[PDB]
Amino acid sequence: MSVISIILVVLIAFLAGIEGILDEFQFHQPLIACTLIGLVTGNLTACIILGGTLQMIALGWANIGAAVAPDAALASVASAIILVLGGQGVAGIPSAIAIAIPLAVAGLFLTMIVRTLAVPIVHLMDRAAEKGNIRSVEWLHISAICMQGIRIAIPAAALLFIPADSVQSFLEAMPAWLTDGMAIGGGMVVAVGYALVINMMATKEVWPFFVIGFVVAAISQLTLIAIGALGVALALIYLNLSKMGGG
Amino acid sequence: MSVISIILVVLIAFLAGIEGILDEFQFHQPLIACTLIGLVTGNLTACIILGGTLQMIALGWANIGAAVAPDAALASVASAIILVLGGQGVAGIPSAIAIAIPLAVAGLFLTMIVRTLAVPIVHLMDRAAEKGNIRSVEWLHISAICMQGIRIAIPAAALLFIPADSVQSFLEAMPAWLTDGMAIGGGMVVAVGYALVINMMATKEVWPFFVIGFVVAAISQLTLIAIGALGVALALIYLNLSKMGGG
Amino acid sequence: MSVISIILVVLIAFLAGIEGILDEFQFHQPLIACTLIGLVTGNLTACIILGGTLQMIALGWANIGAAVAPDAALASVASAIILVLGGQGVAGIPSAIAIAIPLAVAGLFLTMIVRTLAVPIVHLMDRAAEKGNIRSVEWLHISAICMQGIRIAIPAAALLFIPADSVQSFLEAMPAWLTDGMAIGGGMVVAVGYALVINMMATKEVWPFFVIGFVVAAISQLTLIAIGALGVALALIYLNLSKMGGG
Amino acid sequence: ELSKRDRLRVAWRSTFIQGSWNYERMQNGGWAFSMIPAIKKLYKTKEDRSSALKRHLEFFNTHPYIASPILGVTLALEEERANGAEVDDVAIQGVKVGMMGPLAGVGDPVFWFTIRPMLGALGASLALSGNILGPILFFVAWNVIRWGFMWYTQEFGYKAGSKITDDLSGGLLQDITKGASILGMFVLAALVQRWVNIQFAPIISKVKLDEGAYIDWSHLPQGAQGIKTALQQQQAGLALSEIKVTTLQNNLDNLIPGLAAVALTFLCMWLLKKKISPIIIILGLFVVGIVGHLIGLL
Amino acid sequence: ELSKRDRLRVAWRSTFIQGSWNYERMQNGGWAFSMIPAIKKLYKTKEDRSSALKRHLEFFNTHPYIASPILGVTLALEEERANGAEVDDVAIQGVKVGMMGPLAGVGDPVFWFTIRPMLGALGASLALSGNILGPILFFVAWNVIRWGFMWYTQEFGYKAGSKITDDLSGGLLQDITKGASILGMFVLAALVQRWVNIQFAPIISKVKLDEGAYIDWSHLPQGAQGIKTALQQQQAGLALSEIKVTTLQNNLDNLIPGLAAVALTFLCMWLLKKKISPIIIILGLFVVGIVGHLIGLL
Amino acid sequence: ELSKRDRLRVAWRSTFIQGSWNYERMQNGGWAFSMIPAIKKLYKTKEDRSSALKRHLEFFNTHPYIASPILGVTLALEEERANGAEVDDVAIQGVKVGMMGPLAGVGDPVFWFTIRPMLGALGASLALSGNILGPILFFVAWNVIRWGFMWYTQEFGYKAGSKITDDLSGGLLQDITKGASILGMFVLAALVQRWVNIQFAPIISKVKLDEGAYIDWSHLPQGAQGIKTALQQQQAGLALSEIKVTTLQNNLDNLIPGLAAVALTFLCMWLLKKKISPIIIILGLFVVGIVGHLIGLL
Numbered sequence A, B, C: 001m002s003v004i005s006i007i008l009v010v011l012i013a014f015l016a017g018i019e020g021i022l023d024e025f026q027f028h029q030p031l032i033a034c035t036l037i038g039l040v041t042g043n044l045t046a047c048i049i050l051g052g053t054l055q056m057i058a059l060g061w062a063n064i065g066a067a068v069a070p071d072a073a074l075a076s077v078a079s080a081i082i083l084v085l086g087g088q089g090v091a092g093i094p095s096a097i098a099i100a101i102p103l104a105v106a107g108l109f110l111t112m113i114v115r116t117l118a119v120p121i122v123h124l125m126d127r128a129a130e131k132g133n134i135r136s137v138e139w140l141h142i143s144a145i146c147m148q149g150i151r152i153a154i155p156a157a158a159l160l161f162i163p164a165d166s167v168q169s170f171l172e173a174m175p176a177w178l179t180d181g182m183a184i185g186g187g188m189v190v191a192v193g194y195a196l197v198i199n200m201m202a203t204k205e206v207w208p209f210f211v212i213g214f215v216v217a218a219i220s221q222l223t224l225i226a227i228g229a230l231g232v233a234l235a236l237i238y239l240n241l242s243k244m245g246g247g
Numbered sequence D, E, F: 001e002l003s004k005r006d007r008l009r010v011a012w013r014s015t016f017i018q019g020s021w022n023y024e025r026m027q028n029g030g031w032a033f034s035m036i037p038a039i040k041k042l043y044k045t046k047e048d049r050s051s052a053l054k055r056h057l058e059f060f061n062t063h064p065y066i067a068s069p070i071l072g073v074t075l076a077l078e079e080e081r082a083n084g085a086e087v088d089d090v091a092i093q094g095v096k097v098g099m100m101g102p103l104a105g106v107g108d109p110v111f112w113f114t115i116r117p118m119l120g121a122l123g124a125s126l127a128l129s130g131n132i133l134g135p136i137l138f139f140v141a142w143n144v145i146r147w148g149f150m151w152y153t154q155e156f157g158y159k160a161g162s163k164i165t166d167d168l169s170g171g172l173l174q175d176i177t178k179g180a181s182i183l184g185m186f187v188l189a190a191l192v193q194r195w196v197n198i199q200f201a202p203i204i205s206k207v208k209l210d211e212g213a214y215i216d217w218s219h220l221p222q223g224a225q226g227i228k229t230a231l232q233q234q235q236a237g238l239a240l241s242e243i244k245v246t247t248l249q250n251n252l253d254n255l256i257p258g259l260a261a262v263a264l265t266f267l268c269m270w271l272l273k274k275k276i277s278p279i280i281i282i283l284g285l286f287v288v289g290i291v292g293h294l295i296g297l298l
């Protein structure tokens, strides 16, 4: 609404965008990306609930070995802006969570194109590297970082100056076959991200633990934290047995 | 209904009967005894569902060490014939599965009498064995196999030329104390089959695994396949620990 | 009702009271304190149900290392007397179990005061010990045991000669803030009893087993007996692996 | 001289190891039938044919699929004792008896209670959907693995007894026994709990609830509102009926589900340890079930 | 000379090991009472009776049932130090203190939280059905096991200290300690989660559902059809009420059930590690509970 | 001479290890950017600066947090090879490639799938209640542990390669790898089952129930009594509707829940083993999902 609010939200959106692949300070996480954007826009307690709700889903959304994760950063800011612009701070939480998830069609490709646009950047970096001008690499790196931040900075600024729902996007989307196909495909991409890391560590000694974990994760009794604690306990028992068993 | 159909069904019933104790090619299993008998009788897709439903029950129906299992082969053919003769190929599946199970009164006795009727067969086998006529033993064995097939061949042919329900059996059964007592006893005999094999392998090193399996088999969360995978994983972990722990 | 009944119930209440800290023959257990008091009062089958119901709750009510447990003995007799005096031997079981539990306000303080009142008893024991009169210590010990029995003998006798409701207690209790605060605090004290014994035995080798036990104790599938059997099985497997793995 | 296409016939006849099954002698006639070509090729002129029939008609009961190791070791001994006059007529039986228990104990769980249930469930997965590929895959895979196991184990048993001393206690051939035992115990406990119906049907007590438990279905709002009230109150945890019917089954299930099943299994194990024939035990189960339903215990 | 029917009396008096229980000195008077016949028989003429009372009235707390090993080792040492003048007055106390902790740690879980709960559940199984055999079996089996354990451990402790050096670290007498510790940790974690009620009662948010979750209990068909529609819609997963009432208990349960219970147990463990008396801790639990219910946290 | 406040700058710029992320060369520009001050201080007059840029711009992908060991080993080797003419220019690359796989495999699960989910759940516990302390604790604790790891591992890698031979296969530095692998496989299997939605939506059969299963919504009592009859019948287990709608999802769930998820994960693993880029695989998942929804399989 105010001129300070728009610049604060675009600045924090840029910060979240750079942290999207920086992935060190974790602004891109919805548990932080939705509370900083809610503290400065007025209603604060109305956004922490949405941040926690989206953080529940956002677990297991790591970018593993050249395999991106669906809506690491774009959803966290995009749903929060829609929640705060349209009112219903607590009642609009399901509405925002039903819009953050289907943004993988505009969230995954939007980051993949930015990651692949940096090939000329590294080529020019090497080009300046032959002459040994080491002051230009330390400028090109931050240029790449700011380019990465643009992909979140631009849509955040756009959302303010458009209708507060953004469920239309010019065209009402292909007749009910693309909008749900992309959604159902967004729930499968993470498997690829898992598929690499499971491929990263895979021995005949740890496969039975994979089987046990895939079995004991059955219906609605054990939470994710409970399964993690069970895995830690099993690993500790195995290591304690192995230490004395070797010899 | 045709002359070809009756001879095909009695031939496959004879094959299932010999496989009942041959237990090699698994024709006696309802997964096969109900689809071969459904493919040749017309409606095929209406019998595979019944075959799968009876296969779910038929798990854990092994004949272990002179302990027979209830209705290994007779039920698979008998329920399928009733299903196909009386119509309702898909609606009559509960009706067929409600008659396949209570045939243990006519399924276990009918097979055990045939198994004990072959003692004179091996007696005559030895009698011909003293004289060294080894061409007659290979005929007596085939005659025994044919006799084993008869116990399923005869009722299959009888079912066609009687009313298609066969829930009467001449007398309406003793007044509601025999027909249900035999039923509740048929769900208990399998314990004997386990009792021997559990007796077959029983060491102080594997009893805790029996306790764990008997505990983790609790309410409606883990399927049979899940419990099998869990057992395989536990066995593999134990063997991996033991191999390096020995020394 | 009869003069024999009152003396029998007060005698068995005294025996339960002395067994309260004797804790040897287990009369103070509701499985026994409610059936002996029901056998002699007439209706016997109407009290075994209450005894079992209170025994189910009474599991995990051990007095561990100077940490008392709520209503080890007082509740078992007090609920049974109310059940038998007011009729509804089977219908009054919930009424009795709803009064046995909230007696921790009059059950824990009433026993701890008796435990701390015996310090002068052992002081006098030492005083008679310096002169070497060993015939007086063996009298003071049963004197202390009888004093312990009094704390259960007195309320049992009082309950007979008062109205059979006993949910009044002269004053109707502080206005709904004390009677429920004490109740919710009574369900928390046992943790201290656990906290000591867990502190009594705690190594880095057994903590993962604590984690596994705390995890697998989830919603309404495994009973306490099942969890105990699981713990025994895990312990046996660990010991079997350790015995061969050492060397 | 025991050519290969004689072992082909022997292995194919091993498919008929059963069929001549008898309580007096189990799987003896079938074992003799599977050895007929071996007698035919190796012996002559009828003096020792009858000796072969006598020495191949004694007690031999084991798992039908894992029995080809014995059928290979018998040829391995027989082809060299005749050509060399190293007749034993008791070592050929000692090697048979020695591999009776362990082989049955490693074959019965793996085939009957490990591969059979998983393959049946996998086949019925597609079969319950109406797809023939379920049963087709079940048949093809089971027969392929069975025939491959029989062939490979029979050729492995064809190796002389000089290797069987190391091929009996591994190594690797003994570790598989322990793994199969563990897996079989696990699956057998699961089967004992899940698929032994000893559901009792007595009634212990019929107690009416206090006026704080039932929904009190006599003052609810009339029309589309009492519905909501009853549903919410049931979700709260209020007892459905004014009388709490309690059964012995509910009381027994509070300790461990299926306690009667494991108790009966242990009783049958103890009975079998007393050399009681399983037929008498099965008849005992039928009679105890029928008299229990007559009395009303079950 | 410590005849058998003297250790009979000693073991029977060991049943009253408690009774003289005190916060200052725990189980000291009871320990003295259980040793009175040993003092009576072996000592004389009153110079050393008082010394006996002094050296059998110090601090001694352990599990009541597993205490007969100490009561046997003390007799084994005392019957020899008088007859041979090897009186120590410090090794008889060193053995008492050195077997104080481990025996308590191996006896407390086994008897209180392993055998007591299983026996109580087994007894209440029949007791909840109205059958007296439940409590009868509980009483008889519990008495048999306690008396047998105390007698066997007492007569094992009667063996001289030359054997206790090997009978303290096995072998077999140390493995049982580890097994009991594992079983106790498992059961204690289960008890901590299941039977520590810290049920909170705040309310976080009262959000009205969107027009896609509630059943719309204002437009259903009237009579025998709306009922079925509501039941099917509930089975679908539609939210029951217009407002999704959320509690702090629900949010806390999403991490691990009973997080407050384990947190409180850890806090009490840390407090006990600071040498704080358990009575003050119990009073602290009572006061925090009452003030929490006053505030509204609980 | 690699002063401490140069390693501080190097570690701070290591926070920007990513940002110049490319599919051609992953994390190469960021790695070069993190070594700029070290190249500035130790090199001079521009002949070898270009060689340094070529030597620190090759392929290097690992976990962003556990990469400071490499950044410390490279500094340790460079500070000694220039001061001593021990130029190797292939061993400093061999050490980079040698710690590529194991470090990524011990860092990816621990940070992304072990600490991230636990801290996210813990923070959202209070966040779902409206308390800022949740996100505040998440941010503070995560950044504290991240910076502590990045600094301690960096200063440990600053130790010469004479120690890295023992600090690569422990001991303790190899057992942590196995424990992290076990925990990662467990949590990854849980994630694959729980959070891979491949919910099918075909319909297999539409069978009408027999006259013994459905509530018979045509003869129930009218008003507050039919409600009770229907609710008790539902609690009994009677089928709500006349037609038992069965889906392929229901039949597939009877074997193991989430069989499609693990099947797809294994297929993707096999595709990745064929050196196929993950980008093509992700596009394949998108296209297979959209065509499946078009056909109706999903």
Ligand SMILES: OC[C@H]1O[C@H](O)[C@@H](O)[C@@H](O)[C@@H]1O
Pocket: A023, A063, A064, A065, A066, A067, F026, F027, F061, F062, F063, F064, F104, F108
């Ligand atoms: O560890 C592998 C590494 O691969 C890529 O560089 C990125 O996806 C990182 O986030 C990931 O950690």
Ligand SMILES: OC[C@H]1O[C@H](O)[C@@H](O)[C@@H](O)[C@@H]1O
Pocket: B023, B063, B064, B065, B066, B067, D026, D027, D061, D062, D063, D064, D104, D108
């Ligand atoms: O393995 C023992 C063996 O015993 C009997 O011969 C039959 O029941 C077989 O099916 C079984 O395999």
Ligand SMILES: OC[C@H]1O[C@H](O)[C@@H](O)[C@@H](O)[C@@H]1O
Pocket: C023, C063, C064, C065, C066, C067, E026, E027, E061, E062, E063, E064, E104, E108
């Ligand atoms: O075992 C320790 C011991 O401590 C105290 O003396 C009492 O609480 C006993 O009941 C307990 O057994």
